């Protein structure tokens, strides 16, 4: 209501609601979205059009870390990166194991990065064709670059999951940011099980006189 805004585009979802912190990119976003969305709305997407932009309602000024995936869950995207509200997807279950071991929380019902203080979960591309990964890269392209630059003016640390997916990510950004590229939680040989990206993030913050992240707040009991 107070920090929120709206802008109208020519294609579903027709209205994009954002937090004030996103204002400096909305003009371009409108422009780029109007040119691609027709082509893109031809397919059934994950998530549905009306949920594409809900992550623009997050403030950025209180955000220390961006936890970044390449695109949404090929089925069942809620519009919020990483979220499985019934706690079904491997990626979020595997992240929950990491966080379990790191904090010794044995008993829990689920996990959500979007409730965690100072974290913003993100998807590089905002949709995919139902059941197909990276299907919409070609359409999101210039928008993804635009939105991710904006996020990295505010976060100390960018944490990307997918070595292959985010190899050349630094090339996508103009100005530097502490950047860490780890394993996708569904990866060969359990490589994510031995990844210590969450401890590592916290040390890197401390080196920037930033308050570390309480990973445990993301549990749901």
């Amino acid at each position: 209501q107070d920090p929120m805004n709206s802008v109208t585009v020519s294609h579903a979802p027709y209205t994009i609601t954002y937090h004030d912190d996103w204002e400096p990119v909305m003009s371009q976003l409108v422009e780029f979205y109007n040119e691609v969305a027709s082509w893109l709305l031809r397919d059934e997407t994950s998530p549905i059009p009306d949920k594409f932009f809900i992550q623009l309602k997050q403030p950025l000024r209180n955000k220390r870390v961006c936890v970044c995936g390449i695109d949404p869950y090929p089925k069942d995207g809620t519009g919020v990166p990483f979220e499985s509200p019934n706690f079904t997807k491997k990626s979020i279950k595997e992240i929950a194991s990491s966080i379990s071991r790191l904090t010794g929380v044995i008993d829990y019902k689920g996990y959500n990065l979007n409730i965690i203080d100072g974290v913003i979960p993100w998807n590089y591309y905002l949709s995919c064709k139902l059941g197909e990964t990276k299907s919409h890269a070609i359409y999101w392209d210039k928008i993804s670059k635009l939105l991710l630059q904006h996020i990295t003016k505010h976060v100390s640390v960018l944490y990307c999951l997918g070595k292959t997916d985010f190899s050349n990510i630094a090339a996508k950004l103009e100005s530097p940011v502490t950047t860490i590229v780890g394993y996708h939680p569904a990866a060969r040989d359990r490589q994510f099980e031995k990844d210590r990206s969450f401890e590592i993030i916290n040390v890197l913050l401390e080196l920037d006189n930033k308050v570390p992240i309480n990973w445990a707040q993301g549990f749901i009991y």
């Binding site: 502490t178 950047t179 394993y183 990844d195 210590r196 890197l204 401390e206 080196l207 920037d208």
Partner: protein
Amino acid sequence: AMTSSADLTNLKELLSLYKSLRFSDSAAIEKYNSLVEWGTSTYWKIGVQKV
């Protein structure tokens, strides 16, 4: 790697030396500065400068 225990160890040491910062020889200062070079190279940017 950028993501291993070894990385975590190295960064914990860099954090350690950043806190005290009262070095007592060439090796200690060369260590810290070589850690910073390593950090900046691996994670692109970090919060601390060479001394």
